[PDB]
Amino acid sequence: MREIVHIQAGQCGNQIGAKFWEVISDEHGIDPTGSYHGDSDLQLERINVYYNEAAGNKYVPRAILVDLEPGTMDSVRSGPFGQIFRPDNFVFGQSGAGNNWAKGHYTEGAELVDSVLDVVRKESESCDCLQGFQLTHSLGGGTGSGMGTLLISKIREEYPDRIMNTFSVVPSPKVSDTVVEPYNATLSVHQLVENTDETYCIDNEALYDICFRTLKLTTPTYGDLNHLVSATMSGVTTCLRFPGQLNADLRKLAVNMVPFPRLHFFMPGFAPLTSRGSQQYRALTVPELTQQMFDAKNMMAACDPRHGRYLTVAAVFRGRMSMKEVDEQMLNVQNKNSSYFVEWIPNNVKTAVCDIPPRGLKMSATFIGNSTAIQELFKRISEQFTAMFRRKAFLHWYTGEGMDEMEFTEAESNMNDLVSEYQQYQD
Amino acid sequence: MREIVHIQAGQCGNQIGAKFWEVISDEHGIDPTGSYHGDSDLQLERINVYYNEAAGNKYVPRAILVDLEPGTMDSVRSGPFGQIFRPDNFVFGQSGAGNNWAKGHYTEGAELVDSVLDVVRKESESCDCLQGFQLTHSLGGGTGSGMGTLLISKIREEYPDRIMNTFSVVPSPKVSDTVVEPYNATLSVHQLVENTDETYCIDNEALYDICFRTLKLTTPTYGDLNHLVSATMSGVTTCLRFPGQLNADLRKLAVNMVPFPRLHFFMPGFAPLTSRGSQQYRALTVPELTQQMFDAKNMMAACDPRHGRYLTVAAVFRGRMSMKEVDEQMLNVQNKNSSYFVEWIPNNVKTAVCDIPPRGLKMSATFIGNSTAIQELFKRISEQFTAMFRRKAFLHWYTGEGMDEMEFTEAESNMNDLVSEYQQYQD
Amino acid sequence: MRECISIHVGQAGVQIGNACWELYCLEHGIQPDGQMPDSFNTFFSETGAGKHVPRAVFVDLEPTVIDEVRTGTYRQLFHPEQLITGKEDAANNYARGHYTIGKEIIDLVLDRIRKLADQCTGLQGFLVFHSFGGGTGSGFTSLLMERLSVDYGKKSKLEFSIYPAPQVSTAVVEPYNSILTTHTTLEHSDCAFMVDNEAIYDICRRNLDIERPTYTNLNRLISQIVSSITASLRFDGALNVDLTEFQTNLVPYPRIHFPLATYAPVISAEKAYHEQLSVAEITNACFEPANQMVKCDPRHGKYMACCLLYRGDVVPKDVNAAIATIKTKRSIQFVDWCPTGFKVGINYQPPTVVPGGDLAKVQRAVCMLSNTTAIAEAWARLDHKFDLMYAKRAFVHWYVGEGMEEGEFSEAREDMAALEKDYEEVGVDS
Amino acid sequence: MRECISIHVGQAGVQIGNACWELYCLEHGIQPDGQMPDSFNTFFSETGAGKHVPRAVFVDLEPTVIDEVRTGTYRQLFHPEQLITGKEDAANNYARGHYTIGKEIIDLVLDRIRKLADQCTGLQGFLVFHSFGGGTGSGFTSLLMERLSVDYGKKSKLEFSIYPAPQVSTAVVEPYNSILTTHTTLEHSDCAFMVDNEAIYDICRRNLDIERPTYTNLNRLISQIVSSITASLRFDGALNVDLTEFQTNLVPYPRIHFPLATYAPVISAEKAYHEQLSVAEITNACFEPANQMVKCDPRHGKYMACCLLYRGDVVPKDVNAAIATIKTKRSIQFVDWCPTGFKVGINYQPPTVVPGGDLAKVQRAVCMLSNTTAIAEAWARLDHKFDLMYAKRAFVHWYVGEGMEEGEFSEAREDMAALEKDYEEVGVDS
């Protein structure tokens, strides 16, 4: 009954993935050994969405861990919760991809990918009715980006009628940790445009801003950043995992949020978010959550929503709440902020409510916005790509892996077209 | 239901503000943690006028604390009651304004103010029906004066239909602590004339006189002075906070006290005021309070009311009192002192009564007088400004912040016009 | 944040600086090894654990004075790279300081300063200590000030200067150096506190009952003034004055940035017991010519602005009273274009006293910084001195030898003449 | 797996290698007898029980330098067959190294290398240590590199080279050797880190307060750089850089594979206590010309890519901040065809320090590897030097005697001219 298959590719994908798994096990009352020690029957009712049931009262993540480097795998296995994963679901190379999309997509990744495909087929067979796939990775490196994209293509070919979701961490110029990021992002974005049904644009810069400005966190770590992403991930699939008053799964969300096939790039947000000191001076109420969610400072993509228009927003609420209140607050936001919503889609907001709140909170919210302002993110990347490509800088490496210049030209064109399309509907 | 939004700008504004908050929390039975520990249901009935209700039986001041220096903020936070304030409501710079109105109004303050605006918008949104704003500050410095004025302008632009009240501590030549005071006051007064609906003229000199002469206080501190101001502030909004026999809020007071738009500069007074030794030799009665209030020695502005005429007086009484007695005493004062009241406004006195007296007293009174004698205060300031401006002394600093001489000329003209207008109605 | 960077140039600058750093250490409870068993951060960077380092650079063109610091009691306080020394001094020659010898060391010192400044997150500005008379104190400082002005621009620079005496002059060529440095001081300094050794000596003998006051006595006193200026940044009280604030209040015109500093009370342990040193009294004592740090007559000048910086057990009301009293005193006249000439600061911390010092411990002290036309008299005497020597071109050849041109001297003199004239003008009533 | 094979050629190569192996041993807790009372496998093979052997080959054409190793402290660390020695040296003659003397020993060394490589299951590549100036370091290494390139092909080769100084040159014929080796270095090496002894000496005197630094001081420092490069393979942290990764990031065009290495902080025990060596500070210090390992001016060149390799108590956020700060510094210019020129590595292990070493123990260190056009200046001076001597055919006869042809010299010079031109081209903006 509606199983999701999880895939983690490259370092970032793996680490975020681990965080996701940790949170989800806690949510469903699963301990580091795979045993259920929860309180409520609701925690086990839909356990099969994310876990396969093994012999002797144990649950195992329907998760595939992929990397061209074994170090990441080792790190995962040695982590808290590392032992819950199926040993046969770790699919690793020995070499690494050296921040080269071509190595990940055409060479080393190509050699690797068949094993992964074999694993995922088995995982699909195991599930009674697989609704689809969730891939966590980055676009800026070689494995997550090149290998990940390749894997996606393969998956879609075999499961063309299933939902294909990605949580993609994009490279920003402020927090620019690598040189060839523009290339890798450009190449991967193109592929994503044709083969994913919904893509959550996660930005490290935005995460840092959230941590520093909102969470008041003097020294955020990648772990802290990852936590935010994990929360968001949990939010989307809450309706699949628990009961509720109004329920929307992955498909329902897509249908309401994607009016044209290409426009499936979301700016996610999560509410509430408070400092430890500033927690006592707040109201645990729906109007507050709503206020938080639509704010630009709470979006996980480095784009100002006020620089574009919202095509659609999907809001997913967790906790015991008044439907009327939710409906009023959502109508208020669209009436007051009329100018930030496209006028040819009346009621730009879709609402879903799950009765089970996350742990530690009485209420929570997850926001998925499809904004034309996401073009900013793509534009910057394009610019950076151009800056390098005009001089054919670092191209030789890519060509050594069998790539041609023409592919670069194509990808760039494609991305530009996508950008244009978004602009068109923005008006 | 009729929320007031409080703003504190610069050192003086902050400190007086703190005092105000302390008194008000005591009045409404709120302790240093934000928890209600009062006795009467009347203390909580209208708690929402000044406090937002947070989670877990706590109340938080609808207060914004603003300064170009963080030291003031630190001092506030470390004070008794410092922890009641919302951490996100402290909006502070790092540099300071160096007693320069231009830095506060055009430069540093400009950079600062948007954060403040963001905060106050949120604070407005939170309140169900905001009746308006109360700003505490001084006119003689840089932050409170320049930044404060700027903030006022911004506020009025966004809330043109709301009541705009200031408690403005004016520079006196006796207690002249700074050199450029005349400039800062002149520039700010002008701005106040166009954008505030009512302005309480608080004078340090007068406060000192009260403390020394009336309270018999050998060594008054700024705290003691501040207390007086706080009392006055509390007095004005008693009708919004408690029940009563005849009730007048901020609007009702303004409408009765301001016959022409520009003439909204009040000389406040508070009664009773006694020494510790001289407390036992007095009568707790309405005639005594009345006697005290209309006396020149009990006005908080350094102006002799006998040097002008009263356009209007508003008297706000707190405690269980006979309406007849109040009416007789107010008629007596106007009949006996006929020559100090303008003859073309019959019944120059407006009365309001709140049944709840302040703590420690069975009865109290707050006096708001609109006297043409306030021109004295402006005239002195003008003279001092002239003395400096004639030689262009210290102008270079202001011009370094982008200011032109012409602005000075304008401000001076404006103030002179105001003075003339007051004289006109004095006759 | 709110850091201040101290630069100590030449012998005089070094020696004053030593005293200053002794005083700061005592004030913040920092031991001579940098350990402290907060506000101290205005003067000190903090490293790792149990170490505080002065935000200071010490420069001399000769090694001798700095070498003492290296060998001495506070050797662990400063890191070696902040104590900068050449090989040969400027030999009382401005030219050698500014050009011939100074051009070899200036870049290095600037680099170090930049490194120091990069470590500070809220730089208020610079405190520059140097003599007017020495070749390094004049020539080098002038050069340094230019460079700092270029690199940093709108940062406030405050210079504490040992201006030469009318009578008690130790070198022959002092007037030349003084004139030359003044020219540059005008354009690149935001506020300059001139100080006169003779005046300090008189104070030590008359007020402290010291038969034989030496430089160590002067320096200690001088440091106190600096402490009063910076106490508003290093502590907090009822009424506060930042440096920018101070500048705004005290400086009416860009060129007129020469306030006279005076400190009160300066008393002996035994003499103080009998005296009832009230706020009013000390304030009154501030405006008396005998307690001045520069030899000159305020009675013959007019006040344009005074900053009064109180510290210790002081309340506003009594300060106000004192100010009122001062207003009513006919012998203290203020210019007509300043209806109120008082900026007032009040800080809670009483002045701390150096063990083995000449000054007694008091509950309250005050530092008055006042811009009076009377200081122009000093310039007049110095100018006169310059003019005699220049009449004969005495010693001029030396300066020329080191690359200076005769025209520069004339230019400098002209500049000072213009300045004196400006000072005269502001004085007169309308 | 992930092994790296080290080859140490000639005196310089041997001596650097000694230091390196001392450092590695200390880092992995391996005693000088091979016993260790995991990641060390990147540098060591393991045999039987309580024995670890360096993945290294030491070669010299003369016995003297290697003989020291055999007699000395680490005699048990290496097996005898990995220390290869001929009888007669190349006598500062490239020809003797590459042809006459080198042809007798090259096969043997290759065989041993092959044996060594067969024992490794995940070969990352080779680290080759040698001088540019010596007959063995130039001629032999060149030959060896060719053979390795042939046999192994697509394996990464990284060469650490003691490039000759502008002033401080120890042999007369250095420019000839340097020019000749460079030609071959171009085609057969994937990345080359040039280093200059003069620069190291300056660093030792200025930053470490050492009056008289000897080769042992240089070598130790050099080893640290190598450790930083290979720490990403020998440990693990938050952000990791493999060799291939490094190459991808740092090398924009095949021929432009000459990054300059710089290490920070290099400080004394006493001098470091006072300094607050933050991430921002050390990063800033990296981009300063005074701390460079090659004598040349980056201010006159443009950056194409920099790898920053941090180690110890470091978090990403502050590295990012540092990078941002660097971006805003006008004096550090990057070419327009590189919108982000920063590859960043962060490793958890602080730098370990050799007992009796010149460097103080720090919580954090950084190794910056930056490809700047400024290095071309070194080549220009070397070329100039070459051109003078060749004008007179000075010493040429010797080379000819050992089988070299005159045409080779000209060819080599041409190649270097072409390379300099290429470097110029990449520099210019569009």
Ligand SMILES: Nc1nc2c(ncn2[C@@H]2O[C@H](COP(=O)(O)CP(=O)(O)OP(=O)(O)O)[C@@H](O)[C@H]2O)c(=O)[nH]1
């Ligand atoms: N939000 C997070 N961002 C991360 C995390 N780890 C890495 N990153 C970011 O992602 C980029 C580096 O990507 P990766 O390590 O995932 C490259 P990958 O291992 O997939 O392929 P290779 O090219 O083979 O290394 C860069 O922007 C990092 O700063 C993480 O845990 N959270």
Ligand SMILES: Nc1nc2c(ncn2[C@@H]2O[C@H](COP(=O)(O)CP(=O)(O)OP(=O)(O)O)[C@@H](O)[C@H]2O)c(=O)[nH]1
């Ligand atoms: N009645 C009171 N008057 C005060 C108080 N604090 C300061 N003042 C008076 O106000 C004037 C100094 O004003 P401020 O410290 O508020 C100047 P502000 O901090 O707003 O701007 P800056 O110029 O940036 O310092 C002066 O007349 C003081 O004597 C107070 O607590 N009560």
Ligand SMILES: Nc1nc2c(ncn2[C@@H]2O[C@H](COP(=O)(O)OP(=O)(O)OP(=O)(O)O)[C@@H](O)[C@H]2O)c(=O)[nH]1
């Ligand atoms: N108040 C005070 N004055 C000093 C001190 N040391 C020197 N002076 C005065 O400074 C002037 C002499 O200048 P120095 O500072 O010794 O000379 P310098 O700056 O080192 O210049 P050169 O030695 O010529 O390179 C004279 O007026 C001295 O009286 C001191 O410790 N305190």
Ligand SMILES: Nc1nc2c(ncn2[C@@H]2O[C@H](COP(=O)(O)OP(=O)(O)OP(=O)(O)O)[C@@H](O)[C@H]2O)c(=O)[nH]1
């Ligand atoms: N940094 C450093 N440089 C060295 C060392 N030993 C020698 N050199 C430099 O290396 C160059 C001389 O080359 P060597 O390596 O001694 O000569 P070789 O490779 O043994 O060649 P031949 O003896 O001619 O066969 C000169 O530039 C020396 O300064 C060392 O231990 N450290």
Ligand SMILES: [Mg+2]
């Ligand atoms: Mg990786």
Ligand SMILES: [Mg+2]
């Ligand atoms: Mg202030």
Ligand SMILES: [Mg+2]
């Ligand atoms: Mg000297």
Ligand SMILES: [Mg+2]
């Ligand atoms: Mg040799």
